[PDB]
Design a protein around this ligand. Structure first.
Ligand SMILES: *[C@@H]1O[C@H](CO)[C@@H](O[C@@H]2O[C@H](CO)[C@@H](O)[C@H](O)[C@H]2NC(C)=O)[C@H](O)[C@H]1NC(C)=O
Ligand SMILES: *[C@@H]1O[C@H](CO)[C@@H](O[C@@H]2O[C@H](CO)[C@@H](O)[C@H](O)[C@H]2NC(C)=O)[C@H](O)[C@H]1NC(C)=O
Ligand SMILES: *[C@@H]1O[C@H](CO)[C@@H](O[C@@H]2O[C@H](CO)[C@@H](O)[C@H](O)[C@H]2NC(C)=O)[C@H](O)[C@H]1NC(C)=O
Lengths: 57, 50, 7
């Protein structure tokens, strides 16, 4: 949504681009657009949805 | 100098004009072509003009 | 949120 996806070699994070501060990737750190079929160089990883564990109650 | 993949650099330059970066990644072939063609027209202009 | 508030 703003920043970059990066990996430390095993895990994927989103950081702001001018200072390394990694965040867990979530449905509000990010925005959706279309299928995985189109993008040159997309990778497969989990996105955490912060509502889902709350809405489980 | 910090290395960055050229298509991801161009995605940030799309954010700098207020166009969302998915508009580049979903159209990357069409933006890479047409850039390449617009550069070819520079060679043809400078070769043919006086 | 309203579809998930079906929970
Ligand atoms: C990439 O980052 C993750 C998350 O910081 C690292 O894995 C964690 O490392 C800590 C400290 O060693 C452990 O307590 C956790 O159990 C690890 N797992 C998770 C999911 O937090 C991971 O080691 C890093 N990878 C590299 C190659 O440095
Ligand atoms: C990323 O994830 C997708 C979906 O989980 C993977 O696509 C499947 O790949 C297997 C093996 O090639 C096929 O049998 C399935 O039919 C594929 N499903 C779809 C929906 O295409 C994909 O392989 C993963 N990419 C990488 C690089 O691991
Ligand atoms: C956006 O404009 C481009 C051209 O700038 C269109 O792409 C062309 O589509 C025709 C379809 O017959 C092809 O013959 C051309 O070779 C394409 N050009 C390039 C450079 O690839 C594109 O279809 C337009 N998209 C929309 C949604 O209008």
């Amino acid at each position: 949504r703003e920043g970059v996806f990066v990996s430390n070699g095993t895990h994927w994070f989103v950081t702001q681009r001018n200072f390394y501060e990694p965040q867990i990737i979530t449905t509000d750190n990010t925005f959706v657009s279309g299928n995985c079929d189109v993008v040159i160089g997309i990778v497969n990883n989990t996105v955490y949805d912060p509502l889902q564990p709350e809405l489980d109650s | 100098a910090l290395q960055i993949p050229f298509a991801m650099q161009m995605a940030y330059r799309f954010n700098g004009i207020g166009v969302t970066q998915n508009v580049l990644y979903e159209n990357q072939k069409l933006i890479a072509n047409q850039f390449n063609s617009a550069i070819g027209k520079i060679q043809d202009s400078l070769s043919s003009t006086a």
